[PDB]
Amino acid sequence: GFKAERLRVNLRLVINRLKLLEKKKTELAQKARKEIADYLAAGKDERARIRVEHIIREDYLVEAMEILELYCDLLLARFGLIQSMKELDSGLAESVSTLIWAAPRLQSEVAELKIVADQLCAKYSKEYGTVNDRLMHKLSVEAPPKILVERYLIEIAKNYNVPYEPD
Amino acid sequence: ATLKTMNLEKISALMDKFEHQFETLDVQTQQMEDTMSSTTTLTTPQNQVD
Amino acid sequence: HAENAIRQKNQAVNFLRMSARVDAVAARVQTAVTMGKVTKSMAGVVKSMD
Amino acid sequence: HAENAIRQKNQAVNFLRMSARVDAVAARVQTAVTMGKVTKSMAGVVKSMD
Amino acid sequence: MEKHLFNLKFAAKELSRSAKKCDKEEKAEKAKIEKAIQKGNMEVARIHAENAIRQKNQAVNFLRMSARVDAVAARVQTAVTMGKVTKSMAGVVKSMDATLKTMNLEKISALMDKFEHQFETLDVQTQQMEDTMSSTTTLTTPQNQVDMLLQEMADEAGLDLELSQRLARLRDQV
Amino acid sequence: MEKHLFNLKFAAKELSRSAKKCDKEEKAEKAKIEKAIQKGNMEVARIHAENAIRQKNQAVNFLRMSARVDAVAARVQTAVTMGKVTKSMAGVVKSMD
């Protein structure tokens, strides 16, 4: 069943957890681009390509978390309309749909999205028995392109003064 | 054990109750000081303080 | 501190006036006690001379 | 340390104003106690003179 | 959690003391290398050399382990302290809930109105008390003597601030 | 509420002493950085450098936590004092009644 105060509390918890995960994962990217530069200085290149695939996935994850933080703050702003109306607003449909979409995709790191999506499905069970395309691309379980990887290596080599040769 | 006996929802409720009870206590001390001034108005004329 | 100073001033005036009144009544009660002692001593003189 | 210093400043202003109010009420309760002692002593004087 | 915090801080201190004693034993083994080369014993010199290199790298490993355990012990220590803060704030919440239900704002308002009105009645009491205390001892304070004494002692400081017969004759008239 | 006020003031003092000892250990680790670079041990220098940065940021965190707990302890202390004032004024009211 839908409880409004539970949904408000869990949206604030999602905001706080996503802020902490953004800070922590940007610091982990700082830590790991140095070891990608260490692999490039040691000479192993395909190893550095796979580590770059890891860090590209982490950076897409950070941008996905700031998109979801934007949408949860939008629900905290329009929570009066949420608690008042019974029909889903057009300004809320994108946010509610992509949070219900992204909550199984981010079940591990943010455990309050499961509760937020359960409350939103209980609120709009009449509609759900839309989703942001850029957010779906950032949550997509798909390997990044090789030119993006090579380009990523180029700027790592430029920052850490390591000679690297692309394809 | 501590994070199952005191969830983040229980922390949020406890902190909202903390903040609202200090709001009510500040209202209490405000009307207390209002009475404590009105009782002893005759020893502090406003013109003498001015 | 200004309303404290004005309060201490008027408060001291009130304590001074109360002290004046209580000292007046205590003086009259003290001469009551002394003339009662004089009355008892004169009654004892009357019965001893009788 | 700057927000600590501003907090200690405004906190000291609040404690000073609370101390002023409680000192006003304590002065009036103290003259209540003293004039109650005066009232009991004058009632004792009345019954002893009676 | 305080026992495990104590054990983590003790483990960090043990790793730091192990790094200190290994850096001391490195210098001792290097002095033994010098004495063995002065005596001309190259197998003894190689044994003390691999001892010195082992004590060096061993001290680096103990130092890095001590750094990691000290990081985790710092975070467990702020865990313990903020858990104490959480329990104290929950106790403050329940104690204020008890006091604010047994003494409402309506009860404060009634108590303060009764406080103010009782001091009004007490001020009326002390007023009529002082009125009687003046009327009893009127004969020791004539008003004319107090008036002339104030006039005298104000003229001395330089501040500068009969009727019964007239009213008796006017009562005699009408 | 006096026990919880004592525990909050003790927790603020513990966080302040933790910030002091971490700012002391930062200077100790920086002296160890200097000695390790004079001896030529760069891995030891990096270990002591990350120790020094950790003690610095750790001391900042303990200082901010001590500031928050000291704010809440000040407000709980004026809660306790004005509750004592309220009980004394209620006793004055019933005695005058």
From Swiss-Prot, chain A:
Modified residues (Phosphotyrosine): 39
Cellular location(s): Cytoplasmic vesicle; Cytoplasm, Cytoskeleton, Microtubule organizing center, Centrosome; Midbody; Nucleus envelope
Signal peptide: none
Region (Interaction with CHMP1A and CHMP1B): 1-155
Subunit comment: Interacts with CHMP1A, CHMP1B, VPS4A and VTA1. Interacts with SPAST, STAMBP, and USP8. May interact with VPS37B. May associate with the ESCRT-I complex. Interacts with MITD1, in competition with VSP4. Interacts with SPART (via MIT domain); leading to the recruitment of SPART to midbodies. Interacts with SPAST.
Assigned protein family: Belongs to the IST1 family.
Function of the protein: ESCRT-III-like protein involved in cytokinesis, nuclear envelope reassembly and endosomal tubulation. Is required for efficient abscission during cytokinesis. Involved in recruiting VPS4A and/or VPS4B to the midbody of dividing cells. During late anaphase, involved in nuclear envelope reassembly and mitotic spindle disassembly together with the ESCRT-III complex: IST1 acts by mediating the recruitment of SPAST to the nuclear membrane, leading to microtubule severing. Recruited to the reforming nuclear envelope (NE) during anaphase by LEMD2.
Name of the protein described by the UniProt record: IST1 homolog
Native source species: Homo sapiens
Gene that this polypeptide is encoded by: IST1
Parent-record interval covered: 5 to 180 of 364
From Swiss-Prot, chain B:
Name of the protein described by the UniProt record: Charged multivesicular body protein 1b
Subunit (UniProt): Probable peripherally associated component of the endosomal sorting required for transport complex III (ESCRT-III). ESCRT-III components are thought to multimerize to form a flat lattice on the perimeter membrane of the endosome. Several assembly forms of ESCRT-III may exist that interact and act sequentially. Interacts with CHMP1A. Interacts with VTA1; the interaction probably involves the open conformation of CHMP1B. Interacts with CHMP2A. Interacts with VPS4A; the interaction is direct. Interacts with VPS4B; the interaction is direct.
Tissue specificity as recorded in UniProt: Widely expressed. Expressed in pancreas, kidney, skeletal muscle, liver, lung, placenta and brain.
Similarity annotation: Belongs to the SNF7 family.
Location of the protein in the cell: Cytoplasm, Cytosol; Endosome; Late endosome membrane
UniProt region (Interaction with IST1), positions on chain: 32-50
Primary role: Probable peripherally associated component of the endosomal sorting required for transport complex III (ESCRT-III) which is involved in multivesicular bodies (MVBs) formation and sorting of endosomal cargo proteins into MVBs. MVBs contain intraluminal vesicles (ILVs) that are generated by invagination and scission from the limiting membrane of the endosome and mostly are delivered to lysosomes enabling degradation of membrane proteins, such as stimulated growth factor receptors, lysosomal enzymes and lipids.
Covered residues, full protein: 101 to 150 of 199
